[PDB]
Design a protein around this ligand. Structure first.
Ligand SMILES: [Zn+2]
Ligand SMILES: [Zn+2]
Ligand SMILES: [Zn+2]
Ligand SMILES: [Zn+2]
Lengths: 72, 71
């Protein structure tokens, strides 16, 4: 039905919100500290000296273990 | 259709996985450091001495701003 299409779009958008904002390919699993923006995978987060959301300096990256995490 | 019910279930499960494991009412927005378990809201994370998942000592709690935040 048309509701199947609406729900597929909602699911796609929620899943996209959990993917890295830089590479768009891997799940978010890293927080920039101390600002707290949690928007990147570990690979993109390691390459940024400044937060890509607020531009605060990244003192270090904290790995986050989230219940929504998925794998092959 | 039955396909619509399957998608509704998937959406509901993903949304429930974003809620605090202690109060089940507020969104997760806090990390226990250094272990990294990110399973609680700010209130529930505040008085835990050890991680509720791995039992590691909680040295401090880091607030997290996630793109899925809606509350
Ligand atoms: Zn990435
Ligand atoms: Zn930031
Ligand atoms: Zn809570
Ligand atoms: Zn832990």
């Amino acid at each position: 039905s048309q509701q199947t299409r609406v729900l597929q779009e909602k699911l796609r958008k929620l899943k996209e919100a959990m993917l890295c904002m830089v590479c768009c390919e891997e799940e978010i699993n890293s927080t920039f500290c101390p600002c707290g923006h949690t928007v990147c995978c570990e690979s993109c987060a390691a390459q940024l000296q400044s937060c890509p959301v607020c531009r605060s300096r990244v003192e270090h990256v904290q790995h986050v273990y989230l219940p929504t995490h998925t794998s092959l």
